[PDB]
């Protein structure tokens with residue numbers, strides 16, 4: 001993290017000196033701080049704010065969360081390495097990637113939902129669907145190192161589980177058909193416009209083709225595709 | 233309705249004491265009010281506003297609509313009950329009212345549909361655009377929807393100018409009821425129909441009563457009532 | 470153009486008198502201007518502004534682009550004719566059509582991407598994805614006479630090429646599967662709603678890709694691809 005943070009500063013410092021119309025915002029958002037945690041809260045606050053919710057209130061809200069849970073910072077960094085490897089600049093991904101931003105703002109919403117602040121967690125969950133166009137129910141359990149390519153259009157149900165190092169592309173739907181939502185193994189690649197329905201199990205290292213409609217379980221390391229989807 | 237309105241005010245009261253940050257907003261929107269019609273209008277006007285349209289201008293507009301049409305109030309309650317009785321995530325009445333893109337969009341549409349029949353079409357499209365921006369629901373003002381409609385995860389939905397949606401229909405996210413130029417060219421949905429996520433239904437075809445259309449399906453033919461349509465291209469089951 | 474603008478000013482002066490809820494906004498946007506570029510620049514600036522980017526700044530940016538490049542003004546009028554022909558009243562298409570407004574904002578980002586103002590280009594690119602719900606990489610080459618119908622949900626890759634007179638619909642994905650790796654769409658093609666096209670494959674002139682289709686192979690001119698996976702018809 002400490003080095004990753006060192007990158008973003010240098011990388012945001014270049015974009016500042018070369019593009020003056022983004023200089024101010026880059027300073028306040030990134031260059032004026034001394035920690036990724038503070039710089040990520042400052043951003044998420046300004047992005048998710050509304051009449052109902054001040055920007056300052058949310059800056060405070062995400063800052064406490066990040067400073068109260070070490071796993072979150074461990075995730076935010078892991079989700080940032082996942083992009084720079086799998087996908088951009090480190091700083092662009094910080095300030096421009098809806099998939100990254102929303103994943104992080106979800107963990108806070110997940111936290112709030114565990115700490116019995118459900119009315120606020122659903123409110124924050126509503127902003128996320130409005131701004132980042134990502135629709136993950138707060139109760140959903142997601143891992144770290146998650147990549148959301150062009151996250152516009154994503155829907156994750158209430159009782160779904162997303163393992164680590166999963167790549168979920170645009171327009172993916174993990175929904176029902178109780179515990180009625182899919183469980184995604186570590187290192188799964190889900191294709192664009194894919195819909196996976198019902199409490200089923202996608203195996204580790206598996207891959208799901210674009211436009212697929214998976215109803216049945218998908219064994220690890222296997223590739224499933226089609227409408228309906230069968231094992232290749 | 234007075235029960236639903238009474239249930240909303242109660243749940244809102246519980247949330248205002250459990251979370252201070254949402255207190256003031258819940259008061260002004262729900263608690264400080266005496267009816268559902270006024271609380272809905274107050275809320276729509278705040279989510280569908282811009283520099284083009286003031287929040288206060290819209291407040292009056294929806295408020296004049298609901299007060300000049302009993303059917304509009306009936307549709308909102310019927311829609312409220314249908315998210316409590318039907319929705320997977322099992323929402324309380326207040327959370328559907330405030331946080332649900334679908335239900336909220338549907339009530340903004342009914343007014344837009346009203347400004348179209350009342351020959352205020354340049355306004356009916358201005359308000360149609362806002363609904364698309366904010367709620368991510370693209371229904372033409374000339375489209376006919378019933379009441380008791382469900383809209384899970386609203387974002388993505390598109391409904392055509394000539395389409396017809398009956399009562400108690402469940403439309404899921406990313407569904408398209410669109411064409412295949414002039415005339416009846418969009419689908420007619422019967423009552424009780426469930427339309428799966430992502431599914432696209434094209435043309436002046438009729439999805440009969442109680443039928444079901446699975447996710448990611450591409451329906452191009454008529455679907456006989458009380459049956460199930462599925463696949464690309466969709467087949468009857 | 471000199472007429473299509475004359476027709477916009479006509480339709481706009483009409484709605485301005487038939488709905489005073491929009492009267493000041495129409496005057497400010499359209500009727501107080503003497504060019505299509507200025508009104509388009511004005512509008513696109515208010516539609517895309519945020520805390521990062523002032524509306525009066527983006528109004529300066531769009532104005533200086535259309536004024537520097539005559540092929541922008543043409544591509545705008547082309548896109549306008551296309552929607553009027555294929556889909557609006559001209560005024561309505563100018564002010565409320567997400568697909569149109571996206572295109573004309575994208576080309577400006579594309580210019581910045583060539584003129585090496587790539588941080589600004591991607592900034593402007595990221596607003597266009599918010600406001601207009603169209604995700605086109607500034608690197609993507611698009612022609613003119615382009616129609617995005619209910620433009621929500623469109624994703625266009627970095628090495629995609631979209632030819633003249635193409636109709637791209639609801640929920641289309643022109644994506645991948647470094648280097649050239651995205652679709653190349655010929656002139657006159659109609660892409661269906663929900664369709665996903667993947668790879669450095671070519672869609673020939675005047676072809677047709679059905680709705681919800683998944684395209685992985687090339688598609689020969691003047692033929693129709695359909696289904697999942699897509700078969701020629």
Ligand SMILES: CC(C)(COP(=O)(O)OP(=O)(O)OC[C@H]1O[C@@H](n2cnc3c(N)ncnc32)[C@H](O)[C@@H]1OP(=O)(O)O)[C@@H](O)C(=O)NCCC(=O)NCCS
Pocket residue numbers: 169189191192207208209210211212223225226232624626643644645646667683685697698
């Ligand atoms: C399926 C995928 C994951 C590749 O995995 P894979 O193991 O290499 O799959 P294969 O290349 O072996 O597929 C070969 C067979 O599966 C079929 N197939 C492959 N991808 C398919 C798809 N997306 N939809 C339907 N069928 C598909 C092929 O038609 C072929 O069928 P065949 O056996 O009858 O000849 C990949 O092709 C894909 O779908 N990626 C989506 C990524 C995306 O959408 N990116 C958008 C970026 S903007």
Ligand SMILES: CC(C)(COP(=O)(O)OP(=O)(O)OC[C@H]1O[C@@H](n2cnc3c(N)ncnc32)[C@H](O)[C@@H]1OP(=O)(O)O)[C@@H](O)C(=O)NCCC(=O)NCCS
Pocket residue numbers: 157174175176177197213215227228320384404428429444445446447448460462463469
């Ligand atoms: C289609 C649906 C309505 C089921 O209706 P149904 O009458 O019970 O049909 P069944 O579940 O009994 O399955 C019947 C057949 O159709 C097939 N089938 C069902 N749903 C399918 C789908 N979405 N795609 C492709 N094939 C499907 C089944 O494989 C089965 O095949 P078979 O004849 O070889 O056995 C349901 O599967 C569905 O798709 N719901 C939408 C899910 C959704 O949108 N969730 C989001 C909530 S967050």
Ligand SMILES: CC(C)(COP(=O)(O)OP(=O)(O)OC[C@H]1O[C@@H](n2cnc3c(N)ncnc32)[C@H](O)[C@@H]1OP(=O)(O)O)[C@@H](O)C(=O)NCCC(=O)NCCS
Pocket residue numbers: 390392409410411412434450452464465619638639660661662677678679680681693695696702
């Ligand atoms: C493919 C399309 C362009 C029609 O073009 P076309 O050249 O006339 O193709 P046809 O109508 O002759 O199709 C006939 C056959 O292709 C099949 N077919 C056509 N369109 C299909 C589609 N979108 N999906 C699956 N199958 C399709 C038909 O079932 C039919 O089957 P058959 O081979 O057994 O006879 C049209 O169907 C389409 O996909 N339009 C999308 C536009 C849209 O989605 N608009 C939304 C507006 S809001």
